[PDB]
Ligand binder design. Sequence first.
Ligand SMILES: *[C@@](O)(C(=O)N[C@H](C)c1ccccc1)[C@H](CCCC)NC(=O)O[C@@H]1CN(C(=O)Nc2c(C)noc2C)CC1(C)C
Length: 215
Amino acid sequence: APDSVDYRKKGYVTPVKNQGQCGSCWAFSSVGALEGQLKKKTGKLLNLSPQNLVDCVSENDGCGGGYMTNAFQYVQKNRGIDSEDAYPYVGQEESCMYNPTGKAAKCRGYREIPEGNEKALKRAVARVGPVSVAIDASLTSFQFYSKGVYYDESCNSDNLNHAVLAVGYGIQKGNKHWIIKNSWGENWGNKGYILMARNKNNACGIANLASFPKM
Ligand SMILES: *[C@@](O)(C(=O)N[C@H](C)c1ccccc1)[C@H](CCCC)NC(=O)O[C@@H]1CN(C(=O)Nc2c(C)noc2C)CC1(C)C
């Protein structure tokens, strides 16, 4: 595995989205991982539908939260997920209206990174591409983040409450980090992104609930 890799520079990552006032971070995280696997398989980069997931994943709770693995399982069983255009995002729960004509990707299962193993997460990001992860993003310091490598001692690895996407890893002036795509628009953080401490005892629980879809 390389010392540093950034999948944004490989054309694997779509623009940063804004989830608005709906607890749908898990859907944006899932779509992000699926988008990366689609680029690798087909050569094409396109926006897939978070709304499809919000409405249709019955084992999740819509705008009230959910798990990424449940979203990958749904896409597999359903044998498809719509593009953003065929099932646009409205930031509220509605009845499931999957449109088979708008199908833009599929899923053939998912795999999980060994809990807490940051080296296994590094090797997965390096081998597979963007990986869905869960973190403690409850701190005020996370909310107002601007630039640099994010670390806060009061972050709790047991309190996973926010779903994001790891689009790579690296080292910024001696400090090892994960490159993290958020879903709060381009005006949050650094153009929608945050660098989070890597190899600092699994800070904010970055490697506690990581997974990627298979295609
Ligand atoms: C998610 O982080 C999100 O959408 N966050 C933004 C900021 C937001 C929150 C609320 C309104 C509008 C925007 C989403 C928030 C859901 C809360 C309503 N988080 C999410 O889906 O996290 C999932 C669900 N998890 C979970 O239930 N874990 C958990 C908690 C919080 N307490 O006890 C448990 C077992 C974890 C996970 C990150 C997978």
